[PDB]
Amino acid sequence: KNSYVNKKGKEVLVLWGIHHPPNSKEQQNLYQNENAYVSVVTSNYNRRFTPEIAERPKVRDQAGRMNYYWTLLKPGDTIIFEANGNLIAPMYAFALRRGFGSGIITSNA
Amino acid sequence: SSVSSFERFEIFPKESSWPNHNTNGVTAACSHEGKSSFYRNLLWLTEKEGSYPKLKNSYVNKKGKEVLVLWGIHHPPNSKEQQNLYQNENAYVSVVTSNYNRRFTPEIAERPKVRDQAGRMNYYWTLLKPGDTIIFEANGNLIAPMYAFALRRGFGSGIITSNA
């Protein structure tokens, strides 16, 4: 269990992953607990995650899956990461400055 | 926004619907008159004689029109409070109708205190059709209805935000 408080005064965008092994033996040699979990929570966020161990097609030569999540952490809001396996914890997060006239375009110029 | 009116009728009577569960669960977050109080349309069900037997209580929509039912599901900050209020760490709720079917499970984990409460309270709803039954089955963490609302659909209605 690890915690961060938003001391930036700006919307901290946190990204984390939840891994899903293709087999139960890999779950037991990377994370020890077969019935592992993760539980990322804030003041208004609350979600538990659980690895769905199952045999799947290889993509980038990987039968495993890797579910990427996010939430906005408000000014002064605390986030509490908790787990006993499969949590791919953030190194870095991004304190956003809102601004208008921005937007995504697809250009070959 | 598409309703003109409804009636506030007691869908599950506080005393008779729960002979095996203490219904007078009350919180400082829902305080009123300065003392701790609770929702006039919900019951916080807890242990009675230090036990929470598996409840199974049912209502049928005999109002002949869309009954909006409201219920909460509690999620403790710790496994001590999960035991002390609900007896079962393997606690669940299951609210089911003709076209509705949903099971709930307490996501127990420590969280940032809001309104001076580390616990969470997830408010769910469903429309109960004319003549349709709703069945509440649980062994913990069900915050059962007291009251529900038989709708009367309106036109020209809508929600506005006005300081006038």
Distance between CA A4 and CA A12 in Å, rounded? 10
Please work out, in degrees rounded to the nearest 5, the angle formed at the alpha carbon of residue A25 by the alpha carbons of A22 and A26: 55
Q: What is the count of structural domains for chain B?
A: 1
Give the H/E segment covering residue A30: helix A24-30
Residue given tokens 């919900």 in the structure block: B42
Burial state string for B92-106 with b = 16 or more CB within 10 A and e = fewer than 16: bbbbbbeeeeeebeb
- Cβ neighbours of residue B113 under 8 Å, at least 6 residues apart? none
Domain that holds residue B105: 1-164
Joined together, the tokens standing for residue B18 give 């729960």
Of the partner residues B75, B112, B122, the one whose CB lies closest to the CB of residue A43: B112
> Which pairs from A47-51 meet CB under 8 Å and 24+ separation?
A47/B107, A48/B107, A48/B109, A49/A18, A49/A86, A51/A18, A51/A19, A51/A20, A51/A21, A51/A27, A51/A85, A51/A86
Structure tokens at B122: 């997830």
Resolution to 1 decimal, in Å? Answer: 9.0
Residue B114: list chain A partners with CB under 8 A.
Answer: 43-44
Residues in chain B within 8 Å Cβ distance of A46: 75, 107, 111, 120, 122
CA angle A89, A90, A95 (to 5 degrees): 150
Residue B144 burial (10 A CB sphere; 0-12, 13-18, 19+):
buried
C-alpha B2: how far from chain center: 24
CATH number at residue B74: 3.90.209.20
Residues composing chain A: 109
For B84, list phi and psi in degrees, rounded to 5: -65, -25
Asked if the Cβ–Cβ distance from B107 to A48 is below 8 Å, we say yes
**Which structural technique was applied?**
cryo-EM
Could you please report the per-residue DSSP string of B50-83?
TB---EEEEEE--SSS-EEEEEEEEE-SSHHHHH
Residues of A in contact with B141 (CB under 8 A): none
Q: Counting runs of H as helices and runs of E as strands, what totals does chain B give?
A: 1, 13
CA distances to A34, A95, B98, B109 from B74, rounded to whole Å, are 27, 32, 25, 12
- Alpha carbons A9 and A96: distance in angstroms, whole number: 10
Residues A33 and A31: their CA atoms lie apart, in Å, by 6
In three-state secondary structure terms, A28 is: helix
* Backbone phi and psi for residue A15, each to the nearest 5 degrees, phi listed first: -120, 135
